[model samples]
Target: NPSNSNLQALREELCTPGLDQGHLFEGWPETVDECNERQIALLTDLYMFSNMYPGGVAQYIRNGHELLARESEEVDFAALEMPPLIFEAPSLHRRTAERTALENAGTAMLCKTVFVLVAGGLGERLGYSSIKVSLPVETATNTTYLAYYLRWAQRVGGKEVPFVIMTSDDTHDRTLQLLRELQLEVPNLHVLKQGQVFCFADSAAHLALDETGKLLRKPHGHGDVHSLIYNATVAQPLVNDWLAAGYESIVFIQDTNAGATITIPISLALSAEHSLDMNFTCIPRVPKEPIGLLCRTKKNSGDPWLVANVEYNVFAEVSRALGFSPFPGSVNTLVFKLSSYVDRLRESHGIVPEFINPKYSDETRRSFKKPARIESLMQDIALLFSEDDYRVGGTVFERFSYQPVKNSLEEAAGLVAQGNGAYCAATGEAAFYELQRRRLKAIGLPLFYSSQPEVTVAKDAFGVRLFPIIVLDTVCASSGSLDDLARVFPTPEKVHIDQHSTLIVEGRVIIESLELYGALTIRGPTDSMALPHVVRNAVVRNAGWSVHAILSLCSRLSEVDRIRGFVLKKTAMAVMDC
Candidate 1:
């Protein structure tokens, strides 16, 4: 036909697709004939996908011809029901059961469980410019999220725990450098990286690009963890090796969940006991909270049901149409049955289902100046398993286990002023302190505050604050380990840390009743010959978290400092300066 020339016309048109985003993805080489053998072969694949996914070529051609979308895409939640939940500390009714599960899971950690930290995030959200995993969970001890987990894995298992971090392009280099630079004393550690997908400018799937030929790209989603774990040639051997090693389950956790380690034991034990393929570590929720809800839902009428974490917006929309608020807070932390997870990965080609949320220019809802991102959720992987064949359950972990550091101090305070939970660095650090204080109170420690008589009060930092600044290292008060707490306190310690005091227990130092008026820090025995210091009646007076000092030393503050809204005075604890 004029056939030969016209036959490849539409196919060729894909590369220079004369859409308004004109010529953004010019053919790789000036002429097709100039392309190298491999480039030509790759170009062939590009055209096919571009034909299948309208914007694929225009958006991703400059980078790699990574698949932007499929020929067909649609997801529906026709009916939803409450997902059964097991309480981790349900009124302490199952105290014996809790201990048994705890003991069983501790043994299981010796081999049955593997871990994946989904940390492909940057700290831009928190007003910090580093990888989010590098942010400190507790500023007093300066234990970062990754550092805390790395040590927790080793301590909990008494051996190396196979662990991996799923990082995005933005965080990969920095995260790896942090691990290597710190010379983390960890073995069997790996980093799985994910690629970004193209963004869509319009519903027609036109590529979002500039007139200068620059294409836009955004992370596909954390859900890329699945595809990376399955498809990344670099990641495959680790997954395969883990399988060969007979690891029965895998724990997937978020980057900023400070208390992930605190509730992990219960998660592992519950998943094993309940025979659940997926166990979501959820927080208590109120209706329409800006968080996902765990639920069982059918895609359409007459369709089989699957357990999935439905976004709060969609969950609310559906609930308005018809609503068990169920377990309200669905943090992305989960426990996955390893074999079943792998089986599904093979079936889905390692790609999770995706959705795009486009912001329209007007009523037509068709035109947009910038591209909207298409996202696939890691939590949605639970949908792959049929409810009948595999159980999907949830557990209500304490709120302490769910404090995610997401907001900046300013934005967080703004939200709080507007009547919302900030969940920022300030609140997150405060929560960490709150959890420890509650833990102490739970274990029969009596505490009183002098400087902080009024419950609500701040200045250059967070607008208001309550509890006195207190920091307990992991060895001082490990979560879920009453034994560690018992050993550290040993008696019904009457602790009086005033509002302005900073009590930093940095190690395994035994603490008796201590009336601390200023900053006091106690480190454990330095060597065998060094006697352990029992800091009792440690009444010292020095500079504490000062309001004037906060503005003076703001820049010197770290990510942890920004959240806590104060810099620990250099005049104190650098120790016994009191």
Candidate 2:
């Protein structure tokens, strides 16, 4: 019953002459009732997507494949001219008074700006089953990728900031579910699902199928962000609404990076203040770094335009020839003027230029002869503008603008280390976490002064043992040396340290709530020790000093006068009630 209408529509579209789509449904169920709900739903979605594009889905792939094959032989990278790089000083800043005034003015414009997040990635390489954004960053707060973005939004723009999350078919429902669990109450949160394309077995144009007979589909890449905004049914209405509401800009960001707090607001303010058509944040590139190069290229008519040379493309060679030395490469965090984007869409008739990527298919098992994955590049939109409309700008940051978590458990582990304040080997700079920590220190957070401090507030003094588990509001201090602290608390016994034991100093703790876990051991003099009159989840062992009275969880330490050298275990049990 679910497939009655959609299946018919799909069959009609695929059966058109000259379409190489006969293999798509070769083993499809004979009748609507014979297929399961998932199959029907997949067919329905595919049919709807096909109808949106010109000449249906097969033609889309055919054109892309043809373009790739033609361009492979025709486009000469060595012959193409390289684009010029525009560099800005990293230490440059607007005057304090001027910045404050501009910020106040920008606050009103912020209401009209939309935040777009491209987060349709899975954790397959990391060997995780859920979406990548759902995984914890392994910080003391155990914040997730989604949570960091939400927090950044809340801190920078509050609830009024609109967010449009672009999700793929593989990650759409799960991402929605994660956002629900986060209870993110942003008023204008919109989740748009993008389309995926089926891969071909070879240049012979056979459809790639899985063991289960389903067509092998891969994400259309980040380039789909354009089509998702312009072509998708659900997104067009929201775009109209934003247009109607006088929304002028959209800040697009990737979800895996933890540096959004530093980049998003600044880039948004920059774009609005300068009235620029588009802008991207960039960092200086190290040797052989695989990131897109932001430079200017000249057309055959001698007209110059901005272009993004992706690392793998033939244009990368052109970038090297042009020499981007002393210039920064793109971090992929970009801001675009909505009016210009809309104008481009109208002028181009709502068609984004399709690019080719040779994506590996599990079915093929051969990476060399992989299928040509058709995608659109968001940066390619720059090509739509000529030199006269050179309102494109790039913001330069010395460090702390980029950290991408992608592929392999090893990379995930490195991400955790970077999040825990380790310097990045790629950028050869302090991690963004360290940068944020420095900002906190500047704001009178009462933290120690060191580039690589031994003990940080709200973080473990020990290095790389476990995640930093300090709550935001808590003002934690340490008197012991870094080496002593590391020795005392080398590693947490549990994945979550709070469930085992946490080291609490002997002092008048000025905090409302504090939970500690692990094998409890108290070491030091207890002559004038003033233990909290009452303690929950308290346990004691190997006591040297005698106590007048000791109380545990659901009990009292009313008579506990002195204590020394004790090993406390279990959740709230007093070993000696002396």
Candidate 3:
């Protein structure tokens, strides 16, 4: 609508600095000890600058607090408001069982995958010995973030789904090695590198100068989004692949939050069904906040744009003038049409803002004494949409899908709670559960009878039905027989037999142990791989068709044989040298 000039203007702006304080250290503290110091400096700067800008500081801080919660020396602020949009609960959709969704659910079935932005700072931030990506953010259960996301993607999107992890030059090789160590070698698993440019010139003069030529400055904020997208080189490829595979919709999420990334197939389907161009996961917006607001805006040419909240003072008044009511701001967990995004990228549409933050120089031998430097780069697709084109479509359903783990020890400690951690972990685990269920449904057939301790092989057989429980394990047939067995036992405990556990059917071996006690019932017309297999020795009594152990087993097998195996064998593994 703006005749493409808008794209040019935004691109120009992306390469330039936005705000300029007379002195780089105008409001910054001389020195600080911990995260509290860092946070105080950052928040204070944000508040002061917001007020200094067209929008009064009060309005900006108000908005920031409303969404992110009050600045805490301890934890992250609360999330902004998220209005209740129309969203159908997963239960509302037609499903064959608690764990599986019907494949042909045109309106109910949603296609989901993971897109991880892996732009992390040097390990020095966390005082780790390795790069940030390789740093262990493991849980008590010992699940790393990368491993967790990979498993989640596979489970939520099916075993053959793809994983796109964007890494940076600083940590690419290191991250790659760590990924391999975790056995994430699936062909579907892809690694992308984010290019890094020095924030400051090597010369001391640049470090000594300020934007106004009065004081020193520092590196910019998280402006690495563009490098990530480019390095991943997935803009077009992802679009084509997803469209071809009927996964026209996708969810893009950051990699830090433990509890915030979950698979909601139902929600995805709804967004796609409604033909929404973009569906961002939003939180509530407060009256006057510094955080970006997601509002409908019309350009000079009258095209609608979904402008996220930013450092604009007139944002509030602009919204009022446009008669725009703010939907909650994005939680950083974003979803949009893949093809639409490809189109946007091809057209060079969207914001590509650069960031300038403050950092130290070794020449100064002093932290605050050194002039601040700015790191500049193009950002990701998030900002490309301006006030005119971005719109709120479909339902803004509230689901617990994001919990970022930023900030230092104090803030991290507070924001990283046991409940939230468990919830996030649960989200990842649930994704795996759903995937396992999906695979089972895909490979299983309906069994009408309730057989007693009987198992058989159904190879390449169409519409084969089995009663009670049918396990797919052991070895027979061909050397590829081991392959099938390997596929069936993907994780630690594949095919969890229920209290009605009846058969341990793997390859040519069919074990009918009396150990398979309890109910002799089978669901008709289901996939064999998805059904629980009975493990007689480790049998737990009174459990009804528990699929937990079997899923884990299958997951491990899938990881070793299918996913990780391919990565290690084919791809050249790289990593950060730190």
Candidate 4:
């Protein structure tokens, strides 16, 4: 094959005698038949990458593997101190006012921003057979993580911002398909595929193959966003396009959280307005949050720098001895000025931090004796900035900012059983749902809480069994209000209530029509009940009714059953012997 000649030339140039050492191809196929299309494509991509790096792709992988072989040394945590809180007393009220003003001016900044979603994970943890973003979380809207993001983009930035979605080899195709099926109107959408490297059982020990006689491959993690941007074979051209388009900043958010509201836009404005190199959204640390802490430290020169330290990355005993405290953990939602990012990248020669990800062979499979994946982290981007350069912006509240759904399906089921839905209470499904609920309420929609006393039929038992319907008008409400509730509530024109319905209103209920079924009870006009209330519905049922009710309707109640505590339709009363 003509391509084979170029592949050979690439090997000669990029894979030198010392670097190649036959180990790089230990279990490589001997014949053409053994090399599948995927393997061929992978080799071709690797060759193309080799042309861009001065040290060649082989040496790049070799250096990473070598680094993984060495045991990581502990850092003295005694010197570790918590990063200064930006939300403390003196600045709290001022920051709040400033943030409010910034939010009012956020849309303009959002137009100039690049929204990046790190969606390089699969749904294996959540027991979803597809990509994680495709897993449906909001049943009412039938919305997935990706859908929520698309809607967010459309709502905030409109067609002005560019959306860069980072996906991996396994998720790339599926993500694209989902986007197409969605017919999302995002104008500047770019799906960038993340790079991958082969897994080594023990790179330092010796070259080895897995039990299947193949080199294991894994994703290079979210931190590879930097490399993905700079690498010519990957997203370099797309980066250039945005740069040419005069995009000033990049906002990176995880796909799982619905972060379009306060967290994203506010952070974007905070970074852009302050002209900071980077801004990270952080939450107050609790005990054992399983996340890295945002901290400031000094080197030999005593210049303070920002870093995110994980437990494994530091020596606990040494750190404690050094008087370092790992508090004020990172939430990983970061906004960066594109200019600062480019400058730092050039200064650092496009190098990012690499870490060791140790893996063990399955006991049943017996693939490899020992293997570790060497990967880079996206948060390490913070290491490139100084104290004055990056600002740690705390969320308005922790629940609104952080909600990571990373667990097994069974674990999610257990969480739901525990009344927390599919995600953990504080940081998963419940938090996300709450965010949406608040968003709806913030816009002035008539939100009916089922558990509230006025809506439930039984004071002691669970309330109404009705699912809320989410409707959108021809155009979204720009002011984020619900003045025209009927245009975006149940149906565009009016609410279609089914026959044989029930009506219960202790407070104010505004609707074009209301339908209820089963046992419905309305008890109110208590001293607390206010006058001149509005209630609309097509039908009202149940014999009991208490008035002093100021119920106004768009149209009069069409039907009523057992009105004024009187049974209209009577059934034969059965007598029981006592």
Better of 1 and 2 by TM-score: 1
Task: Name the 10 consecutive residues with the lowest summed lDDT in model 4.
Answer: 559-568
Candidate 3 lDDT over residue span 483-557, tens digit each: 232343343242344423333233233222323333222221123344344323333343323221112223224
The global Cα lDDT (0 to 1) of model 2 is 0.52
Poorly placed runs, candidate 1 (over 4 Å): 1-30, 34-76, 85-88, 91-111, 210-214, 232-236, 320-327, 450-468, 475-480, 494-500, 506-517, 525-564, 574-578
Q: Rank the candidates by TM-score, best first.
A: 1, 4, 2, 3
Q: In angstroms, how far off is 74's CA in candidate 1?
A: 10
| lDDT (0 to 1) per candidate | 0.65, 0.52, 0.38, 0.52
Highest lDDT: give the candidate number. Answer: 1
User: lDDT by residue for model 4 over 1-578, one digit each (tens)?
Assistant: 32776665554554464355355454667643466775566557656655444465565566655675443443353345555533311111123455446655665676677778888887655545578788544332336788767665655566556888889988899998998898776777877787666555554423334566545556667877776665533245566677788888888887676544446666665655555567667656554345666665554345564555455245345465562233555667777788777777666655676766555466455345456566778878777776675554333335345667665434544544554423321234334434434444543433454432222211121212222223221133232222322223334233332222222222222344444332242322222223322335544434322212113221332211101111112211111111
The Cα error of candidate 1 at residue 407, in Å, is 1.5
lDDT of 2 by residue, 270-295 (tens): 66666667777787765445576666
* Residue-level error in angstroms, candidate 3, position 467: 36
State the lDDT at 76 in candidate 1. 42
Each prediction's number of clashing residue pairs: 0, 15, 92, 18
> What lDDT, from 0 to 1, does candidate 3 have?
0.38
Model 4: per-residue Cα lDDT at residue 111: 68
TM-score of 1: 0.80
Q: Pick the candidate with the highest TM-score.
A: 1
